[PDB]
Amino acid sequence: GGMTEEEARRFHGYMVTGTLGYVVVASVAHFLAWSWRPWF
Amino acid sequence: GMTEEEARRFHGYMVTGTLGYVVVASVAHFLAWSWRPWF
Amino acid sequence: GMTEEEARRFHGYMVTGTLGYVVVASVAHFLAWSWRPWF
Amino acid sequence: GMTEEEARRFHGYMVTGTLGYVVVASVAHFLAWSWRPWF
Amino acid sequence: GMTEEEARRFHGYMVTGTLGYVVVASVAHFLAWSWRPWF
Amino acid sequence: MMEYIDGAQIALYAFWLFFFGLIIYLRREDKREGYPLESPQGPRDGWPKGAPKKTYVHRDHG
Amino acid sequence: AMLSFEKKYRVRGGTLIGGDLFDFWFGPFYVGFFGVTTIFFVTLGTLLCVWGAAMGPTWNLWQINIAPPDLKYGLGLAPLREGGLWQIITLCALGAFGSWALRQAEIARKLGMGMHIPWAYGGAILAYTTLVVIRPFLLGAWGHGFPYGIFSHLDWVSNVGYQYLHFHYNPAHMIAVTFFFTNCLALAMHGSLILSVTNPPKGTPTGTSEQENVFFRDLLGYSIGAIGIHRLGLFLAVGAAVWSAICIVISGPFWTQGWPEWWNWWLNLPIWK
Amino acid sequence: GSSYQQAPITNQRRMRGIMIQSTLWDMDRKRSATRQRYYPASTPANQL
Amino acid sequence: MHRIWLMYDPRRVMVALVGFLAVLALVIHFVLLSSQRYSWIENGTLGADQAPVGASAPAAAAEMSPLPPGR
Amino acid sequence: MHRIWLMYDPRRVMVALVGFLAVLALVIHFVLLSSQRYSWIENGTLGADQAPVGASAPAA
Amino acid sequence: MHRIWLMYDPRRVMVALVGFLAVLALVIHFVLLSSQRYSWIENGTLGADQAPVGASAPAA
Amino acid sequence: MHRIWLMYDPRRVMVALVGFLAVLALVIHFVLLSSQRYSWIENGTLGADQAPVGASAPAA
Amino acid sequence: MHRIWLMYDPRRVMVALVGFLAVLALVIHFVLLSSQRYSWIENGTLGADQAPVGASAPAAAAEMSPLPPGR
Amino acid sequence: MHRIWLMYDPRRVMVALVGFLAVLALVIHFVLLSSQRYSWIENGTLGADQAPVGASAPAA
Amino acid sequence: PVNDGIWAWYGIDDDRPMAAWSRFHATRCVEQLAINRARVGAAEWALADVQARGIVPCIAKAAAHLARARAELADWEAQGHRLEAARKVTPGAWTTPVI
Amino acid sequence: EYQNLFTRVQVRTVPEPGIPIDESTGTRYGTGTFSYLAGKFGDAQIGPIYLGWAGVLSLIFGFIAIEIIGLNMWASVGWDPVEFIRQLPWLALEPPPPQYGLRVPPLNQGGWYLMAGFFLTVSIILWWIRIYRRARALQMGSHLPWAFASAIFLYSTFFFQPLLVGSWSEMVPFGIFPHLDWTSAFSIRYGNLYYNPFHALSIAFLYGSAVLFAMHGATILAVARMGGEREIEQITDRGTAAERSMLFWRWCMGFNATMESIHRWAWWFAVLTTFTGGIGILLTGTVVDNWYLWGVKHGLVAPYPAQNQLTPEQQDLLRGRYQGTAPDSFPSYVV
Ligand SMILES: CCCCCCCCCCCCCC(=O)OC[C@H](COP(=O)(O)OCC(O)COP(=O)(O)OC[C@@H](COC(=O)CCCCCCCCCCCCC)OC(=O)CCCCCCCCCCCCC)OC(=O)CCCCCCCCCCCCC
Ligand code: BCL
Ligand SMILES: CC[C@H]1c2cc3[nH]c4c(c3C)C(=O)[C@H](C(=O)OC)c4c3nc(cc4[nH]c(cc(n2)[C@@H]1C)c(C(C)=O)c4C)[C@@H](C)[C@@H]3CCC(=O)OC/C=C(\C)CCC[C@H](C)CCC[C@H](C)CCCC(C)C
Ligand SMILES: *[C@H]1O[C@H](CO)[C@@H](O[C@@H]2O[C@@H](C)[C@H](O)[C@@H](O)[C@H]2O)[C@H](O)[C@@H]1O[C@H]1O[C@H](C(=O)O)[C@@H](O[C@H]2O[C@H](CO)[C@@H](O)[C@H](O)[C@H]2NC(C)=O)[C@H](OC(C)=O)[C@H]1OC(C)=O
Numbered sequence A: 001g002g003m004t005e006e007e008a009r010r011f012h013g014y015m016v017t018g019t020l021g022y023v024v025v026a027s028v029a030h031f032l033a034w035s036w037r038p039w040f
Numbered sequence B, C, D, E: 001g002m003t004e005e006e007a008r009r010f011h012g013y014m015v016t017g018t019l020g021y022v023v024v025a026s027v028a029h030f031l032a033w034s035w036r037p038w039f
Numbered sequence F: 001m002m003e004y005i006d007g008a009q010i011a012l013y014a015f016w017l018f019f020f021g022l023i024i025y026l027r028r029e030d031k032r033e034g035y036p037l038e039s040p041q042g043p044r045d046g047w048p049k050g051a052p053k054k055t056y057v058h059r060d061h062g
Numbered sequence G: 001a002m003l004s005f006e007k008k009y010r011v012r013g014g015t016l017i018g019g020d021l022f023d024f025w026f027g028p029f030y031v032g033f034f035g036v037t038t039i040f041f042v043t044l045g046t047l048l049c050v051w052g053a054a055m056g057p058t059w060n061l062w063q064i065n066i067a068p069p070d071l072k073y074g075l076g077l078a079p080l081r082e083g084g085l086w087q088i089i090t091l092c093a094l095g096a097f098g099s100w101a102l103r104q105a106e107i108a109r110k111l112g113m114g115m116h117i118p119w120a121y122g123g124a125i126l127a128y129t130t131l132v133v134i135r136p137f138l139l140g141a142w143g144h145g146f147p148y149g150i151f152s153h154l155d156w157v158s159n160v161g162y163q164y165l166h167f168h169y170n171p172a173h174m175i176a177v178t179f180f181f182t183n184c185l186a187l188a189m190h191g192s193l194i195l196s197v198t199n200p201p202k203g204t205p206t207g208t209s210e211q212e213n214v215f216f217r218d219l220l221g222y223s224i225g226a227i228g229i230h231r232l233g234l235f236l237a238v239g240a241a242v243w244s245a246i247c248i249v250i251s252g253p254f255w256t257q258g259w260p261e262w263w264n265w266w267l268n269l270p271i272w273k
Numbered sequence H: 001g002s003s004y005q006q007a008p009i010t011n012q013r014r015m016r017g018i019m020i021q022s023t024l025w026d027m028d029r030k031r032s033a034t035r036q037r038y039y040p041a042s043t044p045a046n047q048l
Numbered sequence I, M: 001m002h003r004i005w006l007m008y009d010p011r012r013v014m015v016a017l018v019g020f021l022a023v024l025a026l027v028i029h030f031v032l033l034s035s036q037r038y039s040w041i042e043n044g045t046l047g048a049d050q051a052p053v054g055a056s057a058p059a060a061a062a063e064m065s066p067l068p069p070g071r
Numbered sequence J, K, L, N: 001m002h003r004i005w006l007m008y009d010p011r012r013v014m015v016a017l018v019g020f021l022a023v024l025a026l027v028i029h030f031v032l033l034s035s036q037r038y039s040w041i042e043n044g045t046l047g048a049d050q051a052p053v054g055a056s057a058p059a060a
Numbered sequence O: 001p002v003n004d005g006i007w008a009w010y011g012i013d014d015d016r017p018m019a020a021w022s023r024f025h026a027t028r029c030v031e032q033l034a035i036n037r038a039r040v041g042a043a044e045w046a047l048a049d050v051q052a053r054g055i056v057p058c059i060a061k062a063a064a065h066l067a068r069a070r071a072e073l074a075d076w077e078a079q080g081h082r083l084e085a086a087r088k089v090t091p092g093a094w095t096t097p098v099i
Numbered sequence P: 001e002y003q004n005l006f007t008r009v010q011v012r013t014v015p016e017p018g019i020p021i022d023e024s025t026g027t028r029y030g031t032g033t034f035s036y037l038a039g040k041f042g043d044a045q046i047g048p049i050y051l052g053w054a055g056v057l058s059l060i061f062g063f064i065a066i067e068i069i070g071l072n073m074w075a076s077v078g079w080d081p082v083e084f085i086r087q088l089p090w091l092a093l094e095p096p097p098p099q100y101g102l103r104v105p106p107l108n109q110g111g112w113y114l115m116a117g118f119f120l121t122v123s124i125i126l127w128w129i130r131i132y133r134r135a136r137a138l139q140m141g142s143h144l145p146w147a148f149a150s151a152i153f154l155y156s157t158f159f160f161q162p163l164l165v166g167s168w169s170e171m172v173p174f175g176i177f178p179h180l181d182w183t184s185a186f187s188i189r190y191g192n193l194y195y196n197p198f199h200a201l202s203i204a205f206l207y208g209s210a211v212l213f214a215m216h217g218a219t220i221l222a223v224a225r226m227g228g229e230r231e232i233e234q235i236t237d238r239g240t241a242a243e244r245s246m247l248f249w250r251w252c253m254g255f256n257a258t259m260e261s262i263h264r265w266a267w268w269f270a271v272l273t274t275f276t277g278g279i280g281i282l283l284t285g286t287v288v289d290n291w292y293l294w295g296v297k298h299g300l301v302a303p304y305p306a307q308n309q310l311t312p313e314q315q316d317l318l319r320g321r322y323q324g325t326a327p328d329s330f331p332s333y334v335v
């Protein structure tokens, strides 16, 4: 199957942005968990 | 597989059903919270 | 594989049967709640 | 396979058998209720 | 295989045999009930 | 009443009689091929004598 | 005597040791060098078993009991009355079972067959060698072997089992039992299928590989095929003996508590500790 | 015994297996699982 | 709604229906026969005022005993 | 209703039915024979007023 | 929304739906029948003010 | 980003999703039902102040 | 860095990634749920100063010579 | 040194490396979590002076 | 992967398209060229046999198989040309040519 | 030397079998497919299944039996889904208390057990009928259903022996480790099952089944290169693979089977495992109550020197009681 470098560059734009957005959500979840009950 | 028109049409329903599911879940959680808070 | 109009016919029955069942189950819960509430 | 008039003919007996069975069960339940109620 | 007139004949014996057996069982219950009733 | 004989002993000898009967049957079946044996003294069967060699009918196809 | 087709096959060759010297038959039996050694170890081992019975309390076949030595003798040969006779018989049995396997290899070679049968029998020899050599040696005394006696070895099996309080909880034993039970099921299915196509009801043609594959397919949901069922039967039967040897060698040398408390690791997985 | 009196519901085991006390419970110390061993208290509402 | 028999072969549906009704009836009869209030074979002749109520305690009987005397 | 015998061979139904009725009867007889009230081989000669009854009104 | 039945065969979906609902209904009835509060075959007649609650009596 | 449905066949995704959501929902409900605090079948009618709380640190 | 997607089929990547994150998330929640400090369904309403803490190293003598609990 | 990527397929070494790091990381975390000293989920808020220590020699 | 098998788990893969010189890829290429030319020869012999005996649906598949054998050969010929070009520009490469 | 233990070259066929041999009533369910993994060890086709009326009902009855067991196990850990997986092998659905004998017990004290046992038993009988009908539809002998009847016989003795001794409490609990607890306690209660001669025989055939399948599996693989795995053609049209198989065992141990009759040895060894087993269970607690003492009577038991000797007052002191009922009270001892 094909996969051109413009398709790869378009996919990378979504894959990075989705990854970072998920890490941002997770960062808020840890901010909430820590303010509720710190683990250190 | 799908044409792009089929994907557009499908996605709108998929987003709608997801949002409807999240709405009902949010009401279910706030009912549960008002009954017996977990924090 | 159905035709589009044939899927549309089945969908009408399928939605109506689903909502009819939910209606019956709603009345079952009205009776169960009147007999012995769980909250 | 089954033709549509043949399906419609069969369905009339399925509905009648179901109704007869539900009726017999309804009398059975009301006998059982009058003997020893469960609510 | 089975023809419809031949089914109609067999259905004669089958319904009659069922009802005959049910009658015999009804009498066995009348005797059992007279000897030691269960309600 | 019988002190020594009991139902477990009886059942066990019933099994032994059956089992030796079965071994005889199986040894007759084992001898449908390769028998009677060739020997310098002529043909030999051993014991028990083997069942006859069996013919198989194939199908007429469809 | 000979089977009607046999004479053609009785060539010289395929021996491992003796060459032509022992390359002959006695009635149905092939001899060879390992046939000679087999009969030596069989005769010596048997006559010593009969001597053990003679100096024991009874000739009753079920009650004869030739016991290993006390544990205090360690890895030495005990006095013959005291278990040394069991130790000599054990050497004869090893010599016989080994000779039998190597004789089977000479026979397979003479017939141009693969070596599967000698190796499949090696699974049983492994299990025996584990019970009387490897496990006793790891425990440090020959006295850990089982006694030679038709019921007295069952008393040994019983007591070894309860040395670990509840031997059913041994995890390798569960696998070994599963193999033995699965093997007996598979044997019944394979035996039934072949006989059912070769002995169909009277007035029915002889069946075919297609019919047995179709039947087998809707029994298990997949068709195993003719080579597959023989690979499976060999795998299950020999695998049972190998897992048996594992289950007994771990009991004592490597695990000493009751077997039920081995399962404590499962309760303590951190997802649910 | 001549006749049987029930234990309180909190003394009744919900696992009926006869060897469980030696085969599992003597090694299992988990607090949730230990709490699951017995039925919880149960009271007619008008007695609360 | 009769078109359900065009998509499903009624030969197969009726076996599944008969089997489902069979297990459901048998489950309910066995449940009741094991209950206190509805053990009709032993206690069917009691009036409703004297049939058991509230016997939900999960160990109503002694768990451990000899077998009944063997005769 | 006779066209049901076009869907199912009565040779199969009659055997299946006789099997079902045989097992059903066997189950019901065994359930009764296992009971106190209807263990008729040992106690069938008792009058209806002498036959066992399950426990009345517990903790009355 | 009807195009869902183009994407999936309705003959498959209805069997899966019926199976799922039957099992779910069976599970929920078993869970309730197993509780004390909803042991309805033994205690269905009690009336709501004297039905069991999962609490311990005050002052023991 | 509806073109997600071009790289993934939605016929496969919707079955995977519904299977996941069904199992996860049941796991969460049974985890709650198993807990002291949320054993709602036995204790759902208790008020929020009456509901159980797991034990604190010992000095608390 | 985008050329990593020339090297791997993105349909295989995303499925492996989502499966990895789902399992990791489940594991971390169930590890926490079995702890005492983060048994949040039972004890989530406790304040942080009231939540359980795993016990310290002993009092520095690490030795016993007690006095009874009061009768 | 970049010439090793002609000797070895980068596509396959990367997968093997990611797998190796994941396994090693999970092993070390669970080894620590099972210890006394580093049972950080229960005792992470203890100060370093308060955390457990494995028993010393008696020096006698 | 049929050729490297288990060693593909450790990232040895001498089939992959290569444009720099590599004695390992050149070795694989020389082996696979011979095998695929023999495989093309057998495929066209089989077509000639089945054409001669005339069975129509078999002639169709024999031609389809031959086309696939030619295509799989052409890939190895392309690999051979890449490596042979890289051989000429790279010191210490082989003296015998690829392809 | 090639061992023939796994297949390096599989072949696909685009149309397929799996569409059955001509079969009449019932329906073929699903479309055939190939597994490459199945094709490594055996034949690759994973494919269509037949049920008919008896197969459908067997699955319905059996599913209910499985649900009742699992729901009771899950209820026994208080519906905790974590403890359900963590404790799964220790969980059971447990038979009724002994004092009920054969009477119907309370629902939570064995009533669910008897229900699950009933639906499982009906499901097993309906599966036997399903197999029997399928063997005849494919125009085969009835060897497989009678082999399966031997397994069902042993299984039924876990109902009939409790019936004969007069209590459902004696039945086997549904549960992984709990049924092994029962298996041990059965041998304890009845004074060591090793001395039950039908148990000894059942083991002799269980071991013999492994001996035969090891020998036969190896034999056929050893001649498979000569076509020896085409066993039906070796039976109807004997080849050199059959002749060599006969000569190997003849030259080894002095006697041999045939390519057909080895499958009869196989069939009878497997069948006799469970048949002798069932007889031994039925005799236990009904004819013999202590198998070791039956062994002493019939001379099975090897003598050992005494490990202890009791005095006559110890003989009276060391007799216990038979185990009774559990204490149904929590005594205060204060006065
Ligand atoms: C509980 C579950 C059990 C589970 C386990 C169950 C195991 C069952 C399988 C084992 C038993 C079958 C063994 C067998 O068939 O061997 C072939 C042999 C002879 O073959 P043949 O083809 O019929 O004849 C050949 C002859 O015509 C020409 O041969 P040749 O001229 O070259 O050589 C002369 C013969 C002379 O025969 C003998 O010497 C007989 C030797 C002993 C025969 C078996 C006696 C009983 C068992 C052993 C007791 C002594 C053992 C110490 O030489 C030979 O043929 C020697 C080859 C045969 C060697 C067989 C060795 C078998 C050992 C079995 C060990 C059993 C251990 C328990 O057959 C026989 O001699 C007759 C066998 C009859 C069936 C045995 C069952 C009888 C049940 C009682 C019925 C009433 C009384 C007969
Ligand atoms: C301390 C333990 C006791 C002991 C107690 C018992 C007891 C008790 C029994 C046995 C039995 C057997 N024992 Mg013992 N056993 C001991 C020591 C041993 C040793 C050994 C090396 O020490 C061995 C090899 C054996 C070997 C054997 C077998 C020969 C025999 C079982 C045959 C069989 O195929 O069963 C496996 C086959 C079956 C169980 C048949 C099952 C068929 C059914 C139809 C399958 C239904 C499946 C269904 C559809 C799916 C259900 C799904 C679930 C509901 C979820 N025992 C010691 C002395 N043993 C049995 C026997 O026959 O005794 C005489 C038996 O009952
Ligand atoms: C000769 C003795 C040996 C033996 C033989 C033997 N066993 C056999 C046979 C034979 C010859 C068979 O032909 C038979 C078989 O089918 O084999 C595949 C069987 C069998 N041996 C079995 C097991 C077994 N055998 C054992 C042992 C033995 N089997 C002995 C060693 C053991 C042991 C050692 O404990 C076990 C556990 C089974 C695999 C099988 C019989 C299968 C059976 O009866 O199943 C009944 C059905 C159920 C329990 C229900 C299943 C429920 C599904 C999971 C539900 C799915 C949902 C469903 C679709 C819903 C319904 C909707 C409808 C509308 C469709
Ligand atoms: C509570 O009662 C039970 C039931 O009696 C006692 O358990 C008994 O003893 C065990 C050996 C056995 O396993 C069990 O089946 C059962 O038989 C249990 O130990 C507790 O005992 C105390 O209460 C007894 C009781 O029955 O209430 C009481 O028994 C005596 O008094 C009652 C009247 O209150 C009378 O009916 C009994 O006949 C009488 N029995 C005896 C032997 O005296 C116990 O008193 C004594 C002295 O045993 C109580 O025991 C104690 C130490 O307080």
Ligand SMILES: COC(C)(C)C/C=C/C(C)=C/C=C/C(C=O)=C/C=C/C(C)=C/C=C/C=C(C)/C=C/C=C(\C)CC/C=C(C)/C=C/C=C(\C)C(=O)O
Pocket: A010, A011, A014, A015, A017, A018, A019, A020, A022, L001, L002, L003, L004, L007, M014, M017, M021, M024, M027, M028, M031, N022, N025, N026, N029, N030, N033
């Ligand atoms: C408690 O004890 C223990 C447990 C032991 C302690 C723990 C220990 C350990 C070792 C933890 C390890 C953690 C870890 C290690 O790396 C964790 C690593 C996590 C990572 C990397 C997460 C990455 C997430 C990325 C996501 C979600 C991406 C989403 C992508 C989206 C949404 C894009 C959608 C669009 C697409 C695809 C394009 C379609 C095409 C289009 C439109 C087109 O073509 O046009």
Ligand SMILES: COC(C)(C)C/C=C/C(C)=C/C=C/C(C=O)=C/C=C/C(C)=C/C=C/C=C(C)/C=C/C=C(\C)CC/C=C(C)/C=C/C=C(\C)C(=O)O
Pocket: B006, B009, B010, B013, B014, B015, B016, B017, B018, B021, K001, K002, K003, K004, K007, L021, L024, L027, L028, L031, M022, M025, M026, M029, M030, M033
């Ligand atoms: C005990 O507590 C523990 C467990 C320990 C705690 C931890 C918990 C954890 C880790 C939870 C994680 C949760 C999670 C993720 O991981 C949760 C993720 C949730 C998500 C994503 C939910 C999404 C739901 C979406 C739905 C329902 C969509 C429905 C769409 C419908 C109906 C329309 C279908 C299309 C139609 C009709 C059109 C056809 C047209 C066609 C065909 C055409 O036009 O062609």
Ligand SMILES: COC(C)(C)C/C=C/C(C)=C/C=C/C(C=O)=C/C=C/C(C)=C/C=C/C=C(C)/C=C/C=C(\C)CC/C=C(C)/C=C/C=C(\C)C(=O)O
Pocket: C009, C010, C013, C014, C016, C017, C018, C019, C021, I001, I003, I004, I007, K021, K024, K027, K028, K031, L025, L026, L029, L030, L033
């Ligand atoms: C305490 O217990 C625990 C377990 C812990 C608590 C938690 C429980 C949980 C998590 C529960 C979750 C529940 C759930 C989640 O979604 C439940 C979801 C339920 C749903 C979706 C129900 C839908 C029902 C639909 C029905 C019945 C449809 C009937 C249709 C009929 C009759 C007509 C069909 C069409 C035909 C015949 C075509 C004819 C024409 C044709 C052919 C033509 O014209 O061609």
Ligand SMILES: COC(C)(C)C/C=C/C(C)=C/C=C/C(C=O)=C/C=C/C(C)=C/C=C/C=C(C)/C=C/C=C(\C)CC/C=C(C)/C=C/C=C(\C)C(=O)O
Pocket: D006, D009, D010, D013, D014, D016, D017, D018, D021, I021, I024, I027, I028, I031, J001, J002, J003, J004, J007, K025, K026, K029, K030, K033
């Ligand atoms: C766990 O705790 C517990 C206590 C168990 C609690 C839980 C309880 C639960 C979960 C209960 C669920 C109940 C339920 C859910 O669906 C129940 C559903 C029941 C249903 C649907 C019943 C339907 C019955 C229908 C019948 C009988 C039809 C008979 C038809 C006949 C006779 C006619 C045959 C046709 C003929 C003659 C024509 C031939 C013509 C031809 C061929 C032609 O004309 O061509």
Ligand SMILES: COC(C)(C)C/C=C/C(C)=C/C=C/C(C=O)=C/C=C/C(C)=C/C=C/C=C(C)/C=C/C=C(\C)CC/C=C(C)/C=C/C=C(\C)C(=O)O
Pocket: E006, E009, E010, E013, E014, E016, E017, E018, E021, I025, I026, I029, I030, I033, J017, J021, J024, J027, J028, J031
């Ligand atoms: C735990 O609960 C527990 C305690 C168990 C309690 C609960 C129990 C329950 C739930 C019971 C349910 C029972 C039940 C449910 O439906 C029971 C249903 C029973 C039924 C339907 C019985 C039907 C019987 C029919 C018979 C006998 C027919 C005989 C026919 C004959 C003789 C004639 C044959 C034809 C001939 C001769 C002509 C050939 C001519 C030809 C060929 C020609 O002329 O061509």
Ligand SMILES: COC(C)(C)C/C=C/C(C)=C/C=C/C(C)=C/C=C/C(C)=C/C=C\C=C(C)\C=C\C=C(C)\C=C\C=C(C)\C=C\CC(C)(C)OC
Pocket: J027, J030, J031, K027, P066, P067, P069, P070, P071, P074, P114, P115, P116, P117, P118, P121, P155, P156, P158, P159, P171, P172, P173, P174, P175, P176, P179
């Ligand atoms: C929601 O769905 C869930 C998640 C719950 C599904 C999951 C279920 C799970 C996890 C199930 C797990 C099941 C397990 C692990 C089962 C283990 C079973 C084992 C190991 C069983 C072993 C032996 C059992 C035996 C031998 C039982 C035999 C029983 C017999 C023979 C009973 C016969 C009963 C009869 C004939 C009853 C008749 C009824 C009458 C009224 C006549 O009473 C006598």
Ligand SMILES: CCCCCCCCCCCCO[C@@H]1O[C@H](CO)[C@@H](O[C@H]2O[C@H](CO)[C@@H](O)[C@H](O)[C@H]2O)[C@H](O)[C@H]1O
Pocket: C008, C009, C011, C012, C013, C016, C017, C018, C020, C021, C024
């Ligand atoms: C399991 C319990 C179910 C309980 C069900 C309770 C009864 C529900 C049915 C109500 C009947 C009226 O409901 C209505 O029926 C008509 C046919 O008459 C269906 O009509 C459907 O088929 C017709 C053709 O036949 C199409 O032209 C139409 O577009 C389509 O919707 C409707 O979709 C349904 O909404």
Ligand SMILES: [Fe+3]
Pocket: G190, G194, P216, P220, P231
């Ligand atoms: Fe075979």
